[PDB]
Design a protein around this ligand. Sequence first.
Ligand code: YAL
Lengths: 227, 14
Amino acid sequence: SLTEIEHLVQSVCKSYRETCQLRLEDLLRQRSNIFSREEVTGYQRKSMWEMWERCAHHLTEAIQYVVEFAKRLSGFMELCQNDQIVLLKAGAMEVVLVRMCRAYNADNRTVFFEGKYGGMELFRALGCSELISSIFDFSHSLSALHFSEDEIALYTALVLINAHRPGLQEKRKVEQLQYNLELAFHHHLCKTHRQSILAKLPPAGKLASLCSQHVERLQIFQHLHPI
Amino acid sequence: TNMGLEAIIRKALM
Ligand SMILES: Cc1ccc(NC(=O)C[C@H](CCC(=O)O)c2noc([C@H]3C[C@@H](CC(C)(C)C)C3)c2C2CC2)c(Cl)c1
């Protein structure tokens, strides 16, 4: 019934707001607080390992917030632990990527980082200009679409709950959860006249895989670098 | 999508 779907929309959006890491209003407020050339040079002077270690810590914290989000979705804690881990492993980094658009300012093409906004040059020490440029382009595309907070909530909830992920054991429970979330999101998009917004989303699987790969690389080779 | 992410997830899940 319509009331149940409205309540599911409310609950998903509430959980997302609870686990969104940074409130969108604070991001918009800090938009005016931009790194000075001295601070950008400071970040560019860091070693590749120092900068990658910081970025990987941030990505890990974001993955933890996405796990917290999943845990607050009705029915996800009913799935067996194996299915929970399969779903999180397969979708959490994509959800991090989606979330990152909230901290992107298309006007000046800067992103929030460690308290202030800075352009792409902040990451000169990462030596992965291709991946950095690609993730900035992805965030730019999502910002251009004016993806709202409720839309991010519902789309990420559906990114996580996917019954087609290889490894699932209880495919029917996951199917039912995904179907209820699809109903909720469809009703929301109809209310807002945003039905076609999903055909315009760009791909994100490759970027998320590369980010997870860098995180794993840093975990692995930590004995050959400083504490 | 790999073992390190799975470690993070297993830690944060329990
Ligand atoms: C385009 C781009 C878009 C968004 C962000 N930043 C946000 O979403 C803020 C978040 C701080 C929140 C908090 O502190 O809790 C944050 N800060 O750093 C990171 C790391 C650096 C990494 C991006 C690349 C690949 C370029 C190194 C993400 C993050 C996000 C949550 C992972 C950045 Cl940085 C770049």
